[PDB]
Ligand binder design. Structure first.
Ligand SMILES: CN(C)c1ccc2nc3ccc(N(C)C)cc3[s+]c2c1
Ligand SMILES: [Cl-]
Ligand SMILES: [Cl-]
Lengths: 70, 70, 70
């Protein structure tokens, strides 16, 4: 009785710990990716300004991207 | 008896809700990152075409990236 | 008795499987995003070198990005 319930509680704790650990690992990556994609957007944006093509590059960019996303 | 099992069921529900909530939050970010990285790839691609260096920029890009990834 | 506990164990397994499946799906995306953002950083970096503006583009990039991130 007591040991079946204690066995069950232990599996609940293992599931909680294992999955929370995987999630935290995936979170760390996703936060890193968010920062990299912001950095890349900034840098691309600067190059666009340097070349003085910002406005047309942007419209072409937004429509092709929306097309790629469907 | 009934209350030990009910206590257990309640912890299973809390684990389910909490983790599902974290996952959904991480999912939202990852989908945002996917859209940003597509947009950035498009824009970089357009700049490459504007500068008329697309083919050589691409080969240099793919090999350095594969190297960075090992 | 036996069937309440067996019912409980079954829900623990469903929670484990379902959430692990969502996590693995989100992981796959995050690993894809990491590779795309590296590729984009490389390509942006190459364009910068081609234009011979690498150093100034970088400083402008890092500070605007840090500003965007607060
Ligand atoms: C080799 N170096 C230093 C550079 C520097 C700036 C440049 N800007 C451009 C702007 C437009 C363009 N078109 C063909 C539209 C071609 C180029 S090529 C180019 C090469
Ligand atoms: Cl991500
Ligand atoms: Cl990116």
């Amino acid at each position: 009785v007591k040991e079946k319930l204690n066995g069950i509680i232990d599996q609940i704790n293992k599931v909680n710990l294992l999955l929370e650990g995987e999630i935290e690992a995936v979170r760390r990556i996703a936060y890193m990716n968010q920062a990299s994609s912001l950095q890349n957007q900034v840098e691309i944006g600067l190059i666009g300004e340097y070349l003085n093509i910002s406005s047309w590059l942007e419209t072409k960019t937004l429509t092709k991207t929306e097309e790629g996303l469907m």
